[PDB]
Design a binder for this molecule. Structure first.
Ligand SMILES: OC[C@H]1O[C@H](O)[C@@H](O)[C@@H](O)[C@@H]1O
Lengths: 219, 211
């Protein structure tokens, strides 16, 4: 099989600036008929791949003309002339000269923006859930940049570990930020043994860590 | 307009057969190859094989040959992908795809929206939906379901700005959980309703989120 090598696998870039991705095949994609059987695709989060360039250098219908492809033989390049915020996603090359068709591993384009602090919100467990004997405490970090962020749970000022999980959204297509949720899970029995529940957030956009908290039962 | 409309998400037991569908419209069905592509969760793309519907000519990836069969039904312009005996490793998203032009295979252009296949011994479990009560922030916690996926919208799709629906997290219980949040003007606190659908369990919930 033909091996497709993409580089870089991660590509930071600033809107307005040019960007370019390399795709190198182990074998020539140049057909006897003169065409290179190499297509480029963009796969945005939660969507199916979409054609950008086919047969080496033909822009597909509807693709903005800031996208272009070039190359021949084994070395190919996708070039974005002026990156937009909406271009975040993963980019793939695919060869169609040899069965089975094979893809590059994908290049994840990350959109650079200014540092942005999270807005932090804490949510006590609902009365409905507490009926059932479990307590989920949720801390939301909204619309921040860059992605690195530390969430520290504290119960009666005791540092928690091993009882929380985090989920992070993909970069927003308009403002290029991330959001994160952390869920602290305790049994109703453990939740009722304590009063102050707090999540402390550390992030580049914050001069000092920010703590949101509540007292159980008080509102 | 070209459409590749794939069948819905599937949960099957190991050892079972499975056939998923790709309903095409908007173009000459008989003279365009249809290819099938696997995407493992958060991974890349693997080409499985393809079929030319006119004469059901097929070409397979040798690593999938014999494990799957591709076929068509011209009378309803539909292509199929079939496993004789599902394995846990077949849990993945599957796409159908079509080349830019009729005739000889030149690569791919149009892609279907994908079909999620989950191969599991476990029974389906519907979520419990709990409120995250309130710029203010509010949302819904969709807890303890299996298999993926769930969908969440706000106010029947009328509220889209400021919504973040998080990737599901797999909990130590072996069940998924996810949260959906929205930021809204503090002054309104308007009626806010999260619409949760977990089709595998016929679970549908419209929770009103109030302070
Ligand atoms: O990011 C540019 C983007 O423009 C459109 O909105 C999308 O539909 C994609 O097809 C394309 O890649």
């Amino acid at each position: 099989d033909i091996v497709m090598t993409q580089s870089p696998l991660s590509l930071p870039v600033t809107p307005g600036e040019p960007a370019s991705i390399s795709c190198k095949s182990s074998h020539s994609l140049l057909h006897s008929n003169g065409n290179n059987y190499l297509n480029w695709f963009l796969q945005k989060p939660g969507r199916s791949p979409q054609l950008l360039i086919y047969l080496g250098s033909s822009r597909a219908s509807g693709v903005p003309d800031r996208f272009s492809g070039s190359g021949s033989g084994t070395d190919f390049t996708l070039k974005i002339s002026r990156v937009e915020a909406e271009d975040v996603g993963s980019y793939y090359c695919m060869q169609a000269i040899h069965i089975p068709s094979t893809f590059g591993q994908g290049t994840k384009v990350q959109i650079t923006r200014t540092v942005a602090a999270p807005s932090v919100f804490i949510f006590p467990p609902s009365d409905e859930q507490l009926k059932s004997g479990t307590a989920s405490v949720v801390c939301l970090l909204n619309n921040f940049y860059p992605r690195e962020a530390k969430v520290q749970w504290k119960v009666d000022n005791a540092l928690q570990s091993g009882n929380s999980q985090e989920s992070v959204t993909e970069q927003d297509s308009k403002d290029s930020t991330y959001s994160l949720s952390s869920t602290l899970t305790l049994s109703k029995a453990d939740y009722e043994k304590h009063k102050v529940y707090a999540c402390e957030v550390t992030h580049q956009g914050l001069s000092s860590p920010v703590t949101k908290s509540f007292n159980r039962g008080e509102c | 307009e070209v459409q590749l409309v794939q069948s819905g998400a599937e949960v099957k037991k190991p050892g079972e057969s499975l056939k998923i569908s790709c309903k095409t419209s908007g173009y000459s069905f008989t003279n365009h190859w249809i290819a099938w592509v696997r995407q493992m969760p958060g991974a890349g793309l693997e080409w499985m094989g393809m079929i030319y519907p006119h004469d059901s000519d097929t070409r397979y990836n040798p690593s999938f040959q014999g494990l799957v069969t591709i076929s068509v039904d011209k009378s309803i312009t539909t292509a199929y992908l079939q496993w004789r005996s599902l394995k846990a490793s077949d849990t993945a998203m599957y796409y159908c795809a079509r080349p830019p032009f009729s005739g000889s295979y030149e690569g791919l252009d149009y892609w279907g929206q994908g079909t999620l296949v989950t191969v599991s011994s476990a029974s389906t479990k519907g979520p419990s939906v709990f409120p995250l009560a309130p710029t203010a922030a509010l949302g819904c916690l969709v807890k303890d379901y299996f298999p993926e996926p769930v969908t969440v919208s706000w106010n029947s799709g009328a509220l889209t700005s400021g919504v973040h629906t998080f990737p599901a997290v797999l909990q130590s219980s072996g069940l998924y959980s996810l949260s959906s949040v929205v930021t809204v003007p503090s002054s309104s606190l308007q009626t806010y309703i999260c619409n949760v659908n977990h089709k595998p369990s016929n679970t549908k919930v419209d929770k009103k989120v109030e302070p």
